[PDB]
């Protein structure tokens, strides 16, 4: 059976045992990368830290 | 016999069978480093795109 289900992104997430654009994330201080596929859970995030692009970074790459 | 010949750089072109400075030059969507020796004629000309200098690139040439 086909059903539409209609709600906020978190029980959307919670409902498909899927992370979806913006559902509720956690955050860990381990990087994701260094868990095991047991230890992952949707929804298991990381914010990188940044970086400014520059003319130079233009010609280097072209 | 030596002659000085005045006139137009497309005139002194067809003259001397050399493309010279400021003549009229043939383009044809096709590069010229594709023809054969026969198929080039003097005066077969490409403009190629354009490249804007910055600094990074003194900095990587250097």
Same mark, same amino acid.
């Given at each position: !059976?086909?059903? +539409?289900? !209609? $709600?906020? %992104?978190?029980?959307? @997430? +919670? &409902?498909? =045992?899927?992370?979806?654009? $913006? @559902? =509720?994330?956690?955050?860990?201080? &381990?990087? %994701?990368?260094? =868990?095991?596929?047991?230890?992952?859970? %949707? $929804?298991?995030?990381?914010?990188?830290?940044?970086?400014?692009?520059?003319? +130079?970074? &233009?010609?280097?790459? +072209?």
């Amino acid at each position: !059976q086909r059903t +539409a289900v !209609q $709600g906020s %992104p978190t029980m959307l @997430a +919670a &409902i498909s =045992k899927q992370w979806v654009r $913006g @559902a =509720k994330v956690e955050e860990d201080r &381990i990087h %994701p990368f260094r =868990k095991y596929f047991e230890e992952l859970q %949707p $929804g298991d995030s990381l914010l990188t830290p940044r970086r400014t692009m520059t003319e +130079a970074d &233009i010609v280097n790459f +072209a």
